[PDB]
Amino acid sequence: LRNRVTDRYFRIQEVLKHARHFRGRKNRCYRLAVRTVIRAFVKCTKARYLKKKNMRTLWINRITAASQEHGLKYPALIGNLVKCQVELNRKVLADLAIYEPKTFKSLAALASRRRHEGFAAALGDGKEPEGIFSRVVQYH
Amino acid sequence: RLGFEGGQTPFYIRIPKYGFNEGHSFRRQYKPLSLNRLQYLIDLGRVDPSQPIDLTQLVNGRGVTIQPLKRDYGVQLVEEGADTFTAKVNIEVQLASELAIAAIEKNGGVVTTAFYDPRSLDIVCKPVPFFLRGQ
């Protein structure tokens, strides 16, 4: 019994269908295509890590720009909002800066107020009472 | 090749020669038949004590297997099971131990030791194949 592959055409098309949009002979010659396709598939897998990293970098850039419009540096806004028990993440804050400028200015005003309360407490020896916005809600 | 260590004298070569197996092919062999086995064969009706028991009856009852081509010279009766041996038999073997003979005699049986040569042993163990030769 002599056996020969009879469906090799379909095996090649599995590679080639992913190479159609490539440039040059990579898009049709199987031996060239396969190598480029393998690199493409590898890049696609790794890119998911970069996608999350770059998205966070974009939100921080936009939040930094939005904060600068109110005279606030990015570290001051992010840190002080946490000290107000406001857990809005960077993605939402960037979305708010663009589509909800009045709400974002309030968040910037709230962060600026909390930052000033921290300054006053730092000058104080602790004898005075904590700032109104400084007060932390406790959970049990 | 197997048995080559890559240069040094192989283990199976550096051991001295000793006549462990010298003349093995010419040594006589006897299949052991115990009184336990003999009594068990009688109990199940495979060897009948009412007739003389020889190699043919032992082989016919599947009590022992004899290989003349492997230098078997017959059966050697062994004393294992002498305490519980109760049958009264007339049995012909090639070798018998002192205790085995006593066990048979104590029950009123007769035991005799007889010699068969390779050709004779082959015929006695399998009579029908011999008869078909036409000799």
Partner: protein
């Protein structure tokens, strides 16, 4: 290229042709026939491969032994060479 552009002629197998309908009959000739004949006697084929199996080296040795004298000169020469080739191969030389 490399794949036929039309369907091959449809395959029509007669499952109930005489050969298939009677396949296996008498494979128990011995068990059911007082062991007058052994099932291996039913086997048709080369004289040296009836009721016997072996690897290629064993087959070549067996064929030369049984029909070597009747073989054609060139065939016998090839068989002798094959056995020598296989003897080294199967013995890890």
């Amino acid at each position: 290229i490399g794949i036929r552009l039309t369907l091959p002629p449809p395959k029509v197998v007669d499952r109930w042709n005489e050969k298939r309908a009677m396949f296996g009959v008498y494979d128990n000739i011995g068990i059911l026939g007082n062991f007058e004949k052994h099932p291996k006697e039913l086997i048709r084929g080369p004289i040296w491969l009836r009721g016997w199996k072996g690897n290629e080296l064993q087959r070549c040795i067996r064929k030369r032994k049984m029909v070597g004298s009747r073989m054609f000169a060139d065939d016998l020469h090839n068989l002798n060479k094959r056995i020598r080739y296989l003897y080294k191969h199967f013995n890890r030389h």
